[PDB]
Amino acid sequence: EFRNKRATRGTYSPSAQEYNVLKPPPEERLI
């Protein structure tokens, strides 16, 4: 779903992603 082992590369797979308080802002995951 997400790979980021190098500061200069990144990858994310939308199609792969599947499904108290109001939810927080999305958090940036990149290095």
Binding site: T11, P14, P25, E28
Partner: protein, 296 residues
């Protein structure tokens, strides 16, 4: 680095002051901001700052503020802004504060020409901004020239026509009078309902090139990614809804979109800098997250 760090956070219409400490996280600062202004609909928002290279940067919430590339300035300066936009304001923005913050941020982009707006629509939007500021038109108080002090129209609209300010005010005033009886908060909402149908609303545009070296734009919005001809940011040349994207990735300046059809070839584009590809991927991940959340 001091034990107590002064911070200024500016929303579209307020300057706020906070004191953080060396170990304070972005999330802790963000939580203080939203609690202060009474904002519950927080998921659209973020804190932006100028980094040490003078580029706008989103603050990471799950990291210490001081561990990020904030400048050697006191106080530290941040702008609180919407990073993500709803698919429909009527489905998601219930609070007055949230509507107002979106209204002011969007209006700023309309007025500075960042968000294209047809002239007649610009006049109608202006009239809702006026209803919000002034309430019901009243011939006894709102005499000719009552709008003289306001910046109400996009610079492109002013420059491309040969109306003077009085002539524009006349068009806006007629609409203003039509809005009689409308709550100021309802005028803000109506403004947003009109603005959200503009083709450039809610789209993050990036300058890219394709393999042939042609200049294009990449747009990221709530619904996916789009590729636009250099000279047409209103209608995508190619659209990629989330459901049609198997993967997006980058290496330095090179960005790749892989379609869900494994037999179809990848789309390759080139951004100006690594920083831009990181921005694109972050906005894709965040928009897609909210897209799914809406539909849970």
């Amino acid at each position: 680095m001091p034990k107590t760090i002064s911070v200024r956070v500016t929303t579209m219409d307020a300057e706020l002051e906070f004191a953080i400490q060396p170990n304070t996280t972005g999330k802790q600062l963000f939580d203080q901001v939203v609690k202060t202004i009474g904002l519950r609909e927080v998921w659209f928002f973020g804190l932006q700052y100028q980094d040490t290279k003078a580029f706008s940067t989103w603050l990471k919430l799950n990291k210490k503020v001081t561990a990020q590339d904030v400048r050697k300035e006191s106080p530290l300066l941040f702008k609180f802004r919407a990073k993500f936009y709803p698919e429909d304001v009527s489905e998601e923005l219930i609070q007055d504060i949230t509507q107002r913050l979106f209204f002011l941020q969007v209006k700023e982009g309309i007025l500075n020409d960042d968000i294209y707006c047809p002239p007649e629509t610009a006049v109608l939007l202006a009239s809702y901004a006026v209803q919000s500021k002034y309430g019901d038109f009243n011939k006894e108080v709102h005499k000719s020239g009552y709008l003289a002090g306001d910046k109400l129209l996009p610079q492109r609209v002013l420059e491309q026509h040969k109306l003077n300010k009085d002539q524009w005010e006349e068009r806006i005033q007629v609409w203003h009078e039509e809005h009689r009886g409308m709550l100021r908060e309802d005028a803000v909402l109506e403004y947003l309902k009109i603005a959200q149908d503009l083709e450039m609303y809610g789209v993050n545009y990036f300058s890219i090139k394709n393999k042939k070296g042609s200049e294009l734009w990449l747009g990221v919005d709530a619904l996916g990614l789009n590729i636009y001809e250099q000279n047409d940011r209103l209608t995508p040349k190619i659209g990629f809804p989330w459901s049609e994207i198997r993967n997006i990735s980058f290496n330095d300046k090179k960005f790749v979109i892989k379609p869900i059809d494994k037999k179809a070839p990848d789309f390759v584009f080139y951004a100006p800098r690594l920083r831009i590809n990181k921005r694109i991927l972050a906005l894709c991940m965040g928009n897609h997250e909210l897209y799914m959340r809406r539909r849970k």
